[PDB]
């Protein structure tokens, strides 16, 4: 039953206290379970207040590179992404996330193949936002956030995406990337845009990764290639138009 305990109220205070490494991790793990297992009204109490405090820490940890910092920091970022997954698992949580300046950007920055499990979780959240039949064709805004991430981390906006798809990485990471690639392309009605994204990825060597990935007997990889190739086939005839 309910009892006096860490409410959303206490987690907000705790996150804003300036915790780091293992006690931060412990707070976040506890918070993720709490967000996932409590009613949406508990998430509402947490909503603007807790989300801001998660992002405050997340942004800092993205700039604080774990190779030159704490071994826990990589896991701390990842656990924030898991907290966000539980937070965005609803109505008003999705809403509050789209009302943040950097929430979308930080989810893209969390797509790092060096911490492969975090990229899997982050790419999934972005993909879920991309396919939304709501707001604004949110997939189109997610692309902007990668363009921002491109200059902030000095990379090509789609370089980390391809880098999941990696013979020599886990299948879930590989695909975590193909999935978001499909999520960016498919919801857009503009044909020239769909082929532009597809061609942009092909410049980055994507064409070479697909041939490696089609040899894999996987579940979801097969599902994602099949979609990518099918939309590619339609788009080719769509561009051709009449003859």
């Amino acid at each position: 039953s309910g009892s006096e305990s860490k409410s959303a109220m206490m987690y907000i205070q705790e996150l804003r206290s300036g915790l780091r490494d293992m006690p931060l991790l412990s707070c976040l793990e506890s918070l993720r379970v709490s967000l996932n297992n409590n009613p949406v009204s508990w998430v509402q109490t947490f909503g603007a207040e807790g989300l801001a405090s998660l992002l405050d820490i997340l942004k800092r940890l993205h700039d604080e590179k774990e190779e030159t910092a704490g071994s826990y920091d990589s896991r701390n970022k990842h656990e924030i992404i898991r907290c966000l997954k539980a937070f965005m698992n609803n109505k008003f949580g999705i809403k509050t996330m789209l009302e943040t300046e950097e929430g979308i950007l930080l989810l893209v920055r969390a797509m790092d193949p060096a911490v492969p499990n975090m990229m899997i979780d982050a790419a999934k959240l972005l993909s879920a936002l991309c396919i939304l039949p709501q707001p604004e064709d949110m997939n189109e805004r997610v692309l902007e956030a990668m363009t921002e991430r491109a200059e902030m981390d000095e990379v090509e906006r789609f370089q980390p995406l391809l880098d999941g798809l990696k013979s020599g990485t886990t299948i879930a990471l590989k695909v975590g990337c193909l999935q978001l690639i499909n999520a960016l392309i498919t919801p857009a009605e503009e044909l020239d845009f769909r082929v532009h994204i597809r061609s942009e990825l092909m410049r980055l060597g994507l064409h070479q990764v697909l041939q490696d990935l089609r040899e894999i007997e996987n579940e979801d990889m097969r599902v994602q290639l099949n979609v990518f190739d099918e939309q590619g086939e339609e788009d080719s005839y769509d561009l051709k138009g009449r003859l």
């Binding site: 996932n36 965005m88 698992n89 879920a128 396919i131 499909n182 009605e189 099949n226 138009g241 009449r242």
Partner: peptide, 29 residues
Amino acid sequence: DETGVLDSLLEALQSGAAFRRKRGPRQAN
């Protein structure tokens, strides 16, 4: 308490059911 909303989107992505979105513009007539 539709706390599951993102979970359903993950299903839709994995099955590829969501990549079945096109309002359908065309110029060929």
